[PDB]
Every structure is written in C-alpha cells, then in structure tokens.
UniProtKB/Swiss-Prot annotation, chains A, B, C, D, E, F:
Assigned keywords, A-Z: Late protein, Virion
Membrane spanning residue stretches: none
Quaternary context: Hexamer. Interacts with gp3 and gp18 on the bottom part of the hexamer. Interacts with gp13 and gp14 on the top part of the hexamer.
Keyword Ribonucleoprotein: no
Cellular compartment(s): Virion
Gene3D superfamilies xrefs: Myoviridae tail sheath stabiliser
Short name of one Pfam family: T4-gp15_tss
The keyword Metal-binding belongs to this UniProt entry's keyword annotation: no
Any one cellular-component term (Gene Ontology): virion component
Name recorded for this polypeptide: Tail completion protein gp15
Organism: Enterobacteria phage T4
Function: Stabilizes the tail sheath structure and acts as a connector between the end of tail and the portal vertex of the capsid.
Length: 211, 211, 211, 211, 211, 211
C-alpha cells in the first residue's frame, strides 16, 4: 500500500534512521534509565496539531501519561531543487533535498543531550555512502552528502512548557524514475555517523506512526 | 468557439500533454489498480474554489466519490516576458512563459509516485523539438527549452486532508501574431520526455474541464 | 475645454491609438463575428469602480447588456522621469513615461487573442517615428522608443468572473513647455505596428469616455 | 514675528517663487480665462486636512466656491543632510535639502498644463545663481543646483474627485549660523527658469496662508 | 545617588552641554525676547509621555502656562558598538555611541532658528578635544569626533500642534572600566562649537529634570 | 538530574560566570552599599513572564520587596552553527554559539555601572583559555573567543518603570559527542576578564533559579 522503491521514501527513511538511535539519560533512585527518542515523519503543522492533542489533559490517567510523550523528534521534507554541479536512471539525476528535523523536549537537559548527539557529526557536512541493489545485480554506489544548513531555537509556554529546536539539513542525493515494486524490491545499505555499514530498515520500522 | 491556432493555447496544451499521462499505482485485494491523474487548466484560486466545492460531502454517494477526486493536477500560466538573448512571424519572437503545475493529493505516497515521474527529466532543463506545419507547407522547427525553476510544498488540514506541491516551470518558446483559423488549422507535433514524437492533441483532449 | 497641444495628451493618444484597433473573433451560429476592443484612459482605481458599477446586475435588460461590456482595455500614466542617456523646446527634453495597459476579459480566449495581437511587436522594444508639425512649418522628427517592461496576470471571481492582465510600457519620448492652442494646433503623424504612417486622431476619437 | 534671515526660510521661498508664477488656461464661452495656481508651505498632512475642510459641502454658498479651491500646490521640506563633495559662515557649509512639491487638481488637463510648465526645466537638474547681499557689502554668489529626483502619481475619489501628483526635489545649497535681523536684512536675488534675474520676494508674497 | 565618573554619564553630559546654550529670538511689542531652549535626557517614549502630561490643560492656570513648555530638546543614547579602527583603561577602548537629539517646537520659525544653530557645525563631523584629569595627575587627552548621521522630520497635529525634528549623531569616544567616585572625582573640560574651552558642568546643571 | 558533562551546559556556565561577579554601588546615609547583580539562565520570554509576576504589586509586603528584584541579568542561548574556519571528539568540532545577555534595571545609573563593567573587555573580542580535564588525565586546552556582536536598548513604562539593554555574544567554541557522567566528571578552569584562572563553578552556583 505504498510505492516501496520510491526515491523520496528512501531518503526519508535514511534521514530518519540516522536519527533513529538517540537516547537520553534520566537518573532515578534505583538507577539510570536510558530512553529512546521516538521519531515521526509528518508535515510540521500536522505533527504539532496531533502533539497538542496527545499533550491534552482529558482525565486522571492522562496526567501521568503526559511525560512519556516528550521528548520526540519530527521529520519532514520541505524543499527540493536540481543540484547544479543517453537516458536517465543510474546514470541518475543529482537532486538536492531539504529536511526539517524538529526536536521537542520538556527539559533543556533533554535537548542538550539529544543535540549533542547530533551536532558534532556535521562539519558542516557529513558524508554517507549508500548502496542500492536491484534484485541481484551489482549494487549501485551513491555518494550522499548531508549538510547542516541552520538551526532555530524556540519555545511555547503555559505556566512549563515545551522547548523546540529545529535543524535544517541539505541532502545532496539522487533522483530517477520509479522502478516498479513488481520488478523487485530494492536492497539498501548505508554508512552511519561512525562509518558503520547498517542496512536501511523498512519505513514502517523507523518512524512511529503519527496516525 | 476558440482561437485554435492561438500561440498561448498551444503552449498550454503542450505543457498539459507532457504531464497528461501520469499514473499512480494503488495496491488492492484483487490486484494492483493503476489510476490516471486528471489534469486541468485554470487559475489556481479558481481551481481551489471549485475543489472545495467538490470536496464537500453533500449526500451519501459523495462520501465515497471523494477519493476519486484526488489526486489531480492543475496547470496555469502565471507570467511571461520577452526572452532577451524585418516583420514578425516565423521569423517569430523569443518569448518566455512561466507555468505553475499544481499537484494535489490525499496521500504522501501518491505525491511521491507522481513527482518521481516528473522531476528526473529536468536537469534543470528539458529540451523538446516542436514541429508546427501550416496547412500543407513545410513544418517550422521551434526549439523549446523547459526549465524547472522551483518547487513549493504545502498542506491544508481538517482532522486528513490534502497535500499540495507546486512546480514552477520556465518555457522558452516562441510568439507571433494570430494566424486566423480560416487560413487553416495548425498541425503540431513534439518530442516527449523520451524523445518520442507524439503529435499535439486538441485542447479538449488533454484537460478535463473545471467547468 | 482642454489644452490640445499638451505633450502628455499627445503621448496618451499615441499609446491609446496603437492599441485602438484590435478585434477578437467570436464564432456565432450565423457566422464569425468580429468585435473591437474599446479603450479608455483613466486612473485604474476609477476604471474598476465604474466597471463594477456597469457589471453589477441591477436588472434584466442588464443581464444581456453585461457581455457587451467586456472585453476592454484601460490605459493610464503611472510614472515619468528624466531620461538620462540654448533654451528648451525643440531642442526638447528627453523624458521617459510609464504606462499601465490593463486588459479585462470574461474569457481566457479573448485574452489570448488580444495579447497575441500586442506581445510580438515588442522585442522588447517597438520603435515609432513621430512627426509633429507646427502650423505650417517643417514638421519635427521625434524618435519614440516604447519598451515592454513587464506583464502581470490576475483574476476577480464570483461563481465566473473576470480575467485581468496588465502590461507595463516604457515610452522614451520628448517634453517641452506648453505651446498655446492659439498659436496654432499641432499636426501629428506616426508609424504604427506595421510602420504604416497613420496620423494621430483627436483624443475624443481614440478613447471611449469613462464619464 | 519670524527670523527674516533664516537660511531655511530663504530656500523655502526661493523654491516657492520658482513655482509661484504658473497659470492654466481654462476656456469659456465669453473667452479664455487664465488662472494662477496658489502655492502654500505646509506639512503635507496638515495641508490635506485643511483641504478636506475647504472642499466639504457645508452649504450652497459653498457649492460654487469649491472649484476656486483647486488647482493648488503645497510645498514642504521633508529631508536634509550634509552634502559630501577657519570658522563657519561664508565660507559656509554645503547642505542638501529635500522638497516635496505637491500638485492637486480636479482635472487631468489642469495637471498636464502645470507639470508641462515644470518638468522640462529639470534635465535632471536646473541651476540658479543666487545673490545674497548683507546690508551694503558685496553680495555673495551662491550656486544653487536643484535636482528633480522622482515623481509620484495618485488619486482620491468620491463618485469626481481629486488628482494628486507630487514632485521630489533635491536642492544643493548652503547653510551657515543665523545672522540676526538686527544686524541688517538680507537682500536676495536669483535666476528663474529663464535666467531672468528676479529678486526674492518676502515670504508673505509668495505663499498663501494655510492658516 | 549616582556613579559620578560614569563614562556613559560623561558622554551624555558632554552632548547635552554642547546643546545646552541655544536660544531663539521671539519679537515682542516691548522688544525682542531671547529664550533658552531647555534640554532633557530621557528615553524618547518617556519624554513624549511626560510632554503630553505637561501640555494637558486641566485647569485655567494651565491655559497660559502651557505655551511655555515648547520649545524643547530631548536627548538620549539609542545605540553603541565597538569602534573598529596591555590591560584596558587609559589606554582605553574605542567605543562608538549613537545619540538621538529631538527638537520639538510649536512654530516652524522656532525650529528654523534652533536647527540653524546646530546644523552648520557638522561637516559632516565636528571635532572636540576632551580633557579628563584624575585627582591631580596629568589630564588625559581623548579625541572625540561627533558625526551628524541623519535627520528626521515629522508632525503631530490637533486642529496646531507640534513639530518634531530629530538629529542622529555618532560620537566616536572612549570607554574604560568604572573608576570609583571614592578614588576621586574626575575633572573634565572640552572644546565647544567655537573651539572655546569650557569645562564640563555637572549633570544636574545641563539637563532639566524630566522627573 | 542533568547531564553534568553537557557541552551546552559548560558554555552556559562559562558565560554566566564571566558575568557572575558584577556589582553596583548604591549610596546610603550610613555608607555605600555594594549589591551583586543576580543572573539567570532562561529563554527570554520565560524570564520576562516570571519577572512580570514578581514585579506585580499585590500587597504591602510586596511594595518594598520591589527594588530587590532589579537589577538583574538573564542569559540565554539563541543560535548556533558550525564555525567554518579520524573520528570526532577531542579532536572536536569548531562550533559557534550565540548568547543574549539581557540586563534589566530600574535606574539608568544602575545600567551605566553594569555595562561599564562589561563593555570595555570586548574589542570587539575577548579571549579565554579553558582547561577541561577528564577524570585525572592530561587536560584539554580549548581556546575560546567571545565576540561582542551588537547591543540593543529598550524600555517598558508605567508612570517608572524598567530599562532593558541586551548584549549579543558570539562564542567561538568546541562541540563533541556526550561523554557519560559515569565515565568521570569533567574538571573545568578558565581565564576571567583579568586573565585570572578561576575554576568553573557548578551550574547550581552561578544561576539563581527562575523556578
């Protein structure tokens, strides 16, 4: 029920999965608890609407169930353009994609931990080699440059309430016409922030559903 | 009831027809269904008005027939200017025309499919050779450069509701004074995204009528 | 009841008259009908007010009489400045005058026809030699460059309603102090869009009255 | 009841007087009537307030007296700055003064007449030699350059009503500390638009009082 | 009740005092009256509040008293920044300070007089040598350049009412850490608009109190 | 209950502590009283809301306790970016951090005292060498350049009421991935405005709690 080999989907999942494995330390009496930051893919307005819905105190079980919601990260595509350096598709087209990575947090410390886990890997760019194999052929080698373009710090108060920092990223990637899922599912690998060759998980696995 | 040989009409139809034959795959229980994206030519404000009129659930048969409406594409001319590099018409005038191609979709996946079918052919430009023959004379050969200028991503929510992406295109074309339909209808051919020589269909054939 | 030899008047009429003789083809049951596009000289705000007064369906004999109103063209001066390349007047002062030519239309087709009759003659400029003779002396030869600067496309809806495209033109002309109508009326000729030497008609002849 | 030798006052009057002597022809049956355009010096907002006060139909004795009010010209200073090319005053300081000259008119024809009498003398500048004599000493020779910087066209409707064109002028003049009226009144002459050496009239003669 | 040796205070007082001694001539029947223009140091908003408070007619004794309030001058610091050309304080730090000098007046004539007394001494700059002596040591010589940056003309009406012209000045001065008033009071002299060496009056002497 | 070795935290504390020790002189009859200006770390809006909560005169016990609140300083991070001049962390990444230092005060004199204690040490930059030791290893030497970028002056009145000046600072520092507190606590020293090597106090000591 979705175009699996979509190039946009692959870039969405790649970006999401780079930021999928981020935890914050939270000290308890019995001991330190490390919690994973759940990440979604959605238009920002959408996400924020639904976030205002979850954070709403309707009953007594909600009062507690409120601090499990934050911290979280929302991801979205916001712009793209041709990337000015016989047919077209591997050899493919140099495209350039703009992503907003929106971190939301109830505690400045939460934010500090998270961003400290992101920010140092972009100087200002972070390279990743991606391998996309078609059926059983030799995989393709796509050089992917991800550039940290800018950051944006903001709040939204009520008495605490909610800290929001947004990073903007430029992916220098590759576009080509759709290759039907029926012609075979694309196998994809990439190098993470430590040059560790992870293989790209299916979409359904990286993003929690806002729905 | 229209000036058939209109230069503007030909550019509207040319653009519309390049993007006329775009389908999205939609996986069903019985098997995959492929649906064509219907295309219109209209002022954007107009299109959106009539679209809000259609999207309104008036009766029970409308509730279903709503997701037959989307996806669609609306096309319009939004600007033109002289294209700065004895009488006038073949030799004609280098003109430059600005088109807004507006894709509306209920599902991110629909969008991904469509745009993946448009975007790779503009690097940033796409050439097409056009042949316009007058009655039975030797056809004229007009070199047409179409350049992808920018993209713009947006929403418009209600609880799903509607994704809207707009591509802006610069057509580098040719203008000349009207040649009366009474002097004979122009025969028009062109090269598609695959250098395949289709001949330009009548207006009534490419655009579904917003009316 | 007006300064006949007014320099501004002469430019208003020249511009008005270049665009005075434009017809659109309108296919009927009995056969093709050609209708002339009527031109007025007025502040834009004004013109649109009176146009909203005329187009308002107050009654039934109006219901029909509404589609005789459109299409039309309103012309106006909007800016002027010294034209940086013993006393003053022939030898006169190089002035530069800015005109807004506003085309209004109920049908996209009407617009296409009209503008296709304007646009090809400005690449980006259109020359005209003007001859202004004083009484019976040797006429003066003023070289007039008219440059197409920009175009602007708009609507204004109600259920159709009205298409509005405005061209902006830079006339590079000549200014001098007023020469009394009592010293004799100035004779003026010019070369039209086909270099055919028409002579400049009186104001009352070119523009229908907005009043 | 005012500092007669005021430098600001002198420039205000020079400007007003260059534009003091302007008439429009107004054709009647009995014969042509020439009317002088009255000029005032006032903040623009002020002038317009009082002008809305005069033009209001309070009675029938007012109804006639309305078309004697327009046309008029309001003049005002709107900016000044040092003019970047032992003590201070002749030798004096190069200053630069900015004037808004505002023409108001009930008929486009009136405007054409007036502005046609102003505009050709500024190409883009108009020089005037000014002679300022102290008591009986040798007059000082101040070269004054007046530059037409821009023009601005506007209306203000009610059913006719009122045309407003504003010229902006850069006077390149001279400033020095105040020379008391008790030390003797300054004698001032200048060259008009025709190099005719008029001598600068007292303020009260050039400007009608808005008060 | 204040840090007497404050560097900011010294610059505020220096500026205030250059403009402390400005009079306007006011011709009366009995004879000419010269009135000194009172100067305050305050935030512009503040000053205007209190000015509206003073100018308000609450009783009958106010009616007369009210027309003595204008003219006046309000002064304030509005910006400062480092002034780009072993420890720090004489040798001290080149700072640059921005002052708004705001002249308010009921009569154009009053304004003309005042400004004619300010404006000619800035071409565009006015130099002044300042001497700050510590206890009994050799005085320090600080070169102070004051530059006239821009001017701004405005009104505020009611039936007269009030003219407001503002000069903006860049003082190129010197900052250093605070030298306690207990370590001895700094003695300060400077050169006025005529290179005449006045010594800096205490704050309380230059500015009338807005409080 | 916070990531002690957080880099953002260290820079917040470094900045806060350079400005931790600022006093103003306040003359009493019994003798001069020196009061330390308290510093907080908070988003500006937050600080201002809570400041409006403290400044509200609710009772008589409140009326006195009003002038103990001011003066104060609020500090916050507002922007950051890569600082464009085998793995990453000491060797670490050149980052650039933007801080808004907001000084609030009831008296101009208070402001003058404070800012005079800040401003002279930034010409436009101030260097500090920081030593960060991990457990017991050899310290790291991070060169920290703090640049004064701009200042901004404002009020907020009610009859006095409150002066607000804001300095903006560019810290040219260093980022690296989080080093767990469990791996040992970081020891930090730095050179203050006088090259005095103080050691960085814990967060809890520098900032008063806004909560």
């Amino acid at each position: 029920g979705y175009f699996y080999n979509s190039s946009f989907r692959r870039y969405a999942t790649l970006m999401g999965d780079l930021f999928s494995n981020i935890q914050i330390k939270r000290q308890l009496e019995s001991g330190d608890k490390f919690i994973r930051v759940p990440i979604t893919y959605a238009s920002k307005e959408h996400f924020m609407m639904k976030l205002n819905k979850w954070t709403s105190i309707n009953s007594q079980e909600d009062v507690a169930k409120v601090e499990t919601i934050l911290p979280r990260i929302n991801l979205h595509l916001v712009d793209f353009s041709y990337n000015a350096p016989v047919v077209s598709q591997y050899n493919p087209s140099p495209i350039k994609m703009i992503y907003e990575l929106s971190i939301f947090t109830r505690y400045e410390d939460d934010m500090f931990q998270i961003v400290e886990q992101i920010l140092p890997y972009f100087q200002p760019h972070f390279n990743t080699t991606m391998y996309e194999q078609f059926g059983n052929d030799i995989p393709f080698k796509r050089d992917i440059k991800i550039v940290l373009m800018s950051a944006a710090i903001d709040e939204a108060i009520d008495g605490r309430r909610r800290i929001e920092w947004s990073l903007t990223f430029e992916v220098n990637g590759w576009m080509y016409p759709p290759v039907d899922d029926a012609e075979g599912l694309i196998r994809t690998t990439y190098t993470d922030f430590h040059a560790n060759t992870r293989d790209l998980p299916d979409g359904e696995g990286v993003f929690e559903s806002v729905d």
